Design a binder for this molecule. Structure first.
Ligand SMILES: Cc1cc2nc3c(=O)[nH]c(=O)nc-3n(C[C@H](O)[C@H](O)[C@H](O)COP(=O)(O)OP(=O)(O)OC[C@H]3O[C@@H](n4cnc5c(N)ncnc54)[C@H](O)[C@@H]3O)c2cc1C
Ligand SMILES: Cc1cc2nc3c(=O)[nH]c(=O)nc-3n(C[C@H](O)[C@H](O)[C@H](O)COP(=O)(O)OP(=O)(O)OC[C@H]3O[C@@H](n4cnc5c(N)ncnc54)[C@H](O)[C@@H]3O)c2cc1C
Ligand SMILES: CC(C)c1ccc(CN2CCC(O)CC2)cc1
Ligand SMILES: [Br-]
Ligand SMILES: [Mg+2]
Ligand SMILES: [Mg+2]
Lengths: 486, 483
């Protein structure tokens, strides 16, 4: 009942810290989670949100959805078949996804059973005191104690949970959690929100909808994907529209009621209405701090409910740390993992290291997808007196042949024009998430535009566009956009 | 007519040099090529080998071939359709490619028409004297003179040409040139060679072959794709096999005769026989120097027939330069282009610049493809006392579902273990050519393995495998492999 490290949440951050502490530094580690495999009732399980109801199944389902475009695009290359025979079997997809996720759940079970001094406990972790975690049967802090774990070090890694707007009829709505288990593909669906989850699910539902189907995405403000490159936000909007998705911007559900046939009658704040089979809310995720009973030991939370941390993931309470989505910063699996690897290398390795939250490569598995690293030009322009933007945008030749002429590839490089340092790189098109990864390494090394343009291209690729840009398309001078420098 | 620069060959390198010299340095520039658009009889044309009968059309055709896998793989993700209705219409592919290539031909024609001081001459360029290029009707130096071009400076940029082995029945075989124009997809095809062209065309023909068809690749050595990472050579061999291609290693054609039905009867040196509809030779490319009459000026060649150059692409003759495949260094479009740009900066800009032929990102559009940059571990092991290899290899989750479980993704990072400096990165899998580009930029910046590991991954991707490797899989110490 005594451990060097007790980890609450067997997720992206918690398992990296757990596994590293045990295998690299021979520490004794307890990891707590509420469930051993994916799905209802608690959705996240052993492996965490990404594995169970996140990156991993989403990416499989986006890959499934991409075959709608491949089957169509094949014709330009001479592929012939009965287009009238094409059916998308959603139930097949969900069964394949469930088996893939279950195998990961079982692989992490193997990990725990095989590894000496790495123990999994099932149930709800909360803080009794500075150095004791209690595991209870439920999230009710009044439920039975299953275990009482003594901890020299405590890691909070409980991740996040979907936010559901408190509107009349919210009980008729789902989150991404339930989207992964829909028994049938909705004919009509409203994805609510302008972020990556709404956009990615609009793509998935668009490909699997039965005949006479319609995907509508609504977003309360003027343009989806706030925080991404503006050219890309506008282009994704166009390319989703071109593939049959209806984008309702400046719109937000005020309420939902059930029609007598079980369908949903959505009333917008504007007075507009829409009938759909599914209303998927994807308006935000909030850190999971409530169930940890953090008041018991006085861990400080943020305005927003995230665990306050320093650069070394330390709470205000010594021996208690917090990584990943519970900190309510960048909610990405590789950031959680990086934080956990740094924390353990620091605390047990005696090799202090801090996660760099700048120049983080990330992606949106929109069709086609986004790959991005570092600053968008609007942000650069407020920090740097002179910003250059290098931009290449065109329909690739293969998509002039495929018939998807609307698939404009966008490559933007944002520099500090004073020394040429690359501040950010923004890609839209097939392979963007794959192209961007080694760009993250380039930015860590303070690559300049001349490092890209002096590197020899791999031909033919989309990626080589990044090595062909010698001349700014335009600038920001003290925050002001202009074609040419003074 | 008098020019600052005469370029022989309107190809990848020749067009970069000509355009830069005309537009960046205000020089009067002539460019010579033998055809204004793609295809028979001379195949290459305005735009070069890559445009007309190389990178551009082959990439479109491999993209085409990939649909055979996408159609099959779609089933694991719940896609249903009438498989018996599926036809690969090669005629449509070739027509689509022909249009794309012709549009590029036309765009280069328009570039010459609209760029003052940059003039195109049709015909066969050769050297009359160290400052005179003659353009003739044909490759025969007795053919009619169309032009005599006075040149302060001459750039040789005639590229390469397929090697055909002097075997009985060589006349019954084709090269990649003819493969781009086959009117019907061959039912049975032998690709001869273990290089990228053979492997890429094997995958193209494998997708478009009519029912009951068969693609065979033969190679004299034990393992295809010499020069590539050995794990990747082994895996690509298995993944081609898994997709129905017969890989005949330690095998080479001795002769070809016609069967009575016009099909090709192949006799290998081993005494194996194979009847095919097409024999595509992809055994090598040789620099195109014959037609240039370089004996008129005494430009130094190799016994191989390449133009010898210094690091600045200068021949032994002042004011005569050579770039691209004719130099037999690295036969890649972006290298030819880099050499042309560096030559013109050096000569006309007095901005001395030499192409770095190390740490060049490249690709093989096999199915699935290869992306690579820098040294393979056997080469590193000879140049560095201690070499570390970091390796990740596995069937991606999407290919467990697709049913292509043979599609092992391979990612390997080779380091100087003394300092962590990355020497080579080698990828096999969907997206590898796209992943490797920014790796090229990493190696220019002397990235170390710590720079990869400490970078945050993009998830889920194949590429992130490069940024999660902390610990070597194995080492080479003084040339010797140690686990
Ligand atoms: C639909 C969706 C798609 C996403 N796609 C991507 C993507 O493509 N790429 C990407 O990088 N990120 C993606 N993310 C985000 C990513 O899932 C998270 O950033 C990541 O999982 C956070 O890791 P973590 O370690 O903070 O927690 P998690 O991985 O969420 O692990 C938290 C775990 O703690 C458990 N838990 C919670 N409270 C308790 C308690 N009191 N006691 C015990 N156990 C508890 C939960 O059961 C859960 O398993 C996606 C998220 C979602 C929802
Ligand atoms: C099938 C194939 C696939 C390839 N795929 C790739 C790939 O994916 N990526 C890559 O980077 N490289 C690829 N390459 C290599 C690439 O095509 C060459 O490296 C590149 O084209 C060479 O450029 P260059 O300037 O040397 O010559 P070229 O582009 O070959 O141009 C030479 C030109 O000179 C002309 N010419 C020749 N003799 C004369 C004469 N006497 N007078 C006038 N004109 C003349 C020819 O008509 C030709 O247009 C491929 C090659 C082939 C054959
Ligand atoms: C499919 C399975 C065999 C598997 C499991 C683990 C890896 C390692 N990889 C995982 C994703 C990132 O965290 C980077 C490291 C790769 C493959
Ligand atoms: Br060999
Ligand atoms: Mg154990
Ligand atoms: Mg002109």
């Amino acid at each position: 009942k005594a451990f060097d490290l007790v980890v609450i949440g067997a997720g992206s951050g918690g398992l990296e810290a757990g596994w590293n502490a045990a295998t690299l530094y021979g520490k004794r580690v307890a990891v707590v989670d509420v469930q051993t495999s994916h799905g209802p009732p608690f959705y996240a399980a052993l492996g965490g949100t990404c594995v169970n109801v996140g990156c991993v199944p989403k990416k499989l389902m986006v890959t499934g959805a991409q075959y709608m475009d491949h089957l169509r695009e094949s014709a330009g290359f001479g592929w012939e078949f009965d287009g009238s025979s094409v059916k998308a079997n959603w139930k097949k997809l969900i069964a394949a996804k469930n088996e893939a996720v279950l195998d990961i759940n079982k692989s992490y079970e193997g990990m725990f059973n095989d590894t000496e001094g790495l123990d999994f406990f099932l149930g709800w972790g909360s803080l009794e005191s500075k150095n004791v975690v209690v595991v209870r049967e439920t999230a009710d802090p009044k439920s039975a104690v299953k275990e009482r774990l003594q901890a020299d070090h405590i890691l909070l890694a409980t991740g996040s949970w979907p936010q559901m707007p408190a509107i009349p009829g919210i009980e008729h709505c789902i989150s991404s959690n339930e989207a992964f288990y829909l028994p049938e593909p909705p004919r009509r669906v409203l994805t609510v929100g302008g972020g990556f989850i709404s956009v990615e699910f609009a793509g998935i539902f668009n490909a699997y909808k039965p005949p006479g189907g319609k995907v509508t995405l609504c977003y309360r403000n003027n343009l989806i994907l706030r925080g991404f490159d503006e050219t890309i936000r506008e282009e994704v909007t166009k390319q989703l529209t071109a593939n049959g998705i209806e984008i309702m911007t400046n719109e937000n559900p005020a309420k939902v009621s059930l029609n007598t046939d079980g369908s949903k009658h959505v009333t917008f704040e504007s007075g507009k209405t829409l009938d759909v089979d599914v209303v998927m809310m994807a308006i935000g995720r909030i850190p999971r701090t409530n169930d940890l009973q953090l008041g018991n030991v006085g861990v400080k939370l943020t305005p927003k409910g995230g665990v306050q941390v320093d650069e070394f993931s330390r709470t205000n309470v010594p021996n208690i740390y917090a990584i990943g989505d519970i900190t309510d910063r960048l909610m990405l699996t590789p950031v959680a993992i990086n934080e956990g690897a740094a924390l353990v290398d620091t605390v047990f390795g005696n090799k202090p290291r801090k996660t760099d939250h700048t120049r983080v490569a990330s992606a949106v598995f929109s069709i086609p997808p986004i790959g991005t690293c570092g600053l968008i030009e609007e942000v650069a322009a407020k920090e740097f007196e002179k910003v250059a933007v290098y931009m290449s945008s065109f329909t690739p030749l293969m998509h002039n042949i495929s018939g998807s002429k609307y698939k404009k590839f966008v490559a933007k490089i944002v520099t500090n024009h004073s020394d040429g340092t690359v501040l950010g790189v923004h890609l839209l098109g097939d392979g963007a998430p794959e192209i961007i990864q080694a760009v993250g390494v380039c930015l860590r090394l303070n690559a300049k535009i001349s490092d890209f343009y002096n590197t020899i291209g791999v031909h033919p690729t989309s990626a080589e566009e990044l090595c062909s840009m010698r001349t700014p398309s335009y600038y920001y001078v003290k925050g002001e956009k202009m074609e040419k420098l003074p």
